Amino acid sequence: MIRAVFFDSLGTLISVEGAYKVRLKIMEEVLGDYPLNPATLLDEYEKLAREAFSNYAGKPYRPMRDILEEVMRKLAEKYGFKYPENLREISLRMACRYGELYPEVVEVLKSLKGKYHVGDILQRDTEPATAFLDALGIKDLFDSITTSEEAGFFKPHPRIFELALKKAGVKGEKAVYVGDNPVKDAGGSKNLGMTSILLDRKGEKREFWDKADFIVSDLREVIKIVDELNG
Ligand SMILES: O=[N+]([O-])c1ccc(I)c([N+](=O)[O-])c1
Ligand SMILES: [Cl-]
């Protein structure tokens, strides 16, 4: 049976408008009056961030805030603005202020929490991640919160999933994982026996649906999938 349901909250349950707005507001704060379009800075930042994380996939953990501060230092040198002090404080303030959940998230977590172990699996530094979950109001809706900082390795390394399952006290066969990127999922959770649910809200990832056991566009479909797996 399924006894645990795991999500990637800060990575996949934040609205698309909300995540972009947090990031844009960080760039605007960093730039101040400097004559660079913040949207252009954001685009360049995401490019360099994706590159930097790909270099760390599967590797031993290094604070993500340190990685992103390195990226911002390269951007400051590139465009000529002064490197912002306290970037991680700016970012946490903007996340707490403008972060936004998909509308069905609170309902879904509450509906599951009574009957399953509801867990979060996050590739974030634990302290800002947990503060962000607190600001969003869902921290205490989770039975467990597990991070790459706790596990010691970046995905697709399986240690983070091994730890999340240990916290729930079950083997992977008893657990579902809801994500939006199936490759860092498959490279880890598949070998542990977990059932994978891909969240594809706009149907934009059809070429990866074969890498997932179930595909949904609304998180309220998750309870129906698990309730039925449990007959
Ligand atoms: O998303 N961002 O734009 C962003 C940039 C830099 C940092 I150090 C963070 N942070 O604190 O995680 C976030
Ligand atoms: Cl982080």
Numbering used by the authors: 1 to 231
The authors write:
SNAr1.3 can operate at a rate of 0.15 s−1, perform more than 4,000 turnovers and can accept a broad range of electrophilic and nucleophilic coupling partners, including those that allow construction of challenging 1,1-diaryl quaternary stereocentres. Biochemical, structural and computational studies provide insights into the catalytic mechanism of SNAr1.3, including the emergence of a halide binding pocket shaped by key catalytic residues Arg124 and Asp125. In summary, we have established a biocatalytic solution to SNAr chemistry, one of the most important classes of transformations in the chemical industry.
We facilitated structural analysis by a K39A mutation at the protein surface, which has negligible impact on activity and improves data resolution. Notably, despite performing evolution with aryl chloride 2, enzyme activity is improved by 3.8-fold and 8.6-fold using the bromide-containing and iodide-containing analogues of 2, respectively (3.67 ± 0.04 and 8.34 ± 0.11 mM−1 min−1). To explore the potential importance of the halide binding site, SNAr1.3 crystals were soaked with substrate 5. The corresponding structure revealed two distinct anomalous signals in close proximity, associated with the iodide substituent, suggesting that the substrate binds with considerable conformational heterogeneity. Notably, the major 5 pose places the halide substituent directly adjacent to the aforementioned halide binding cavity.
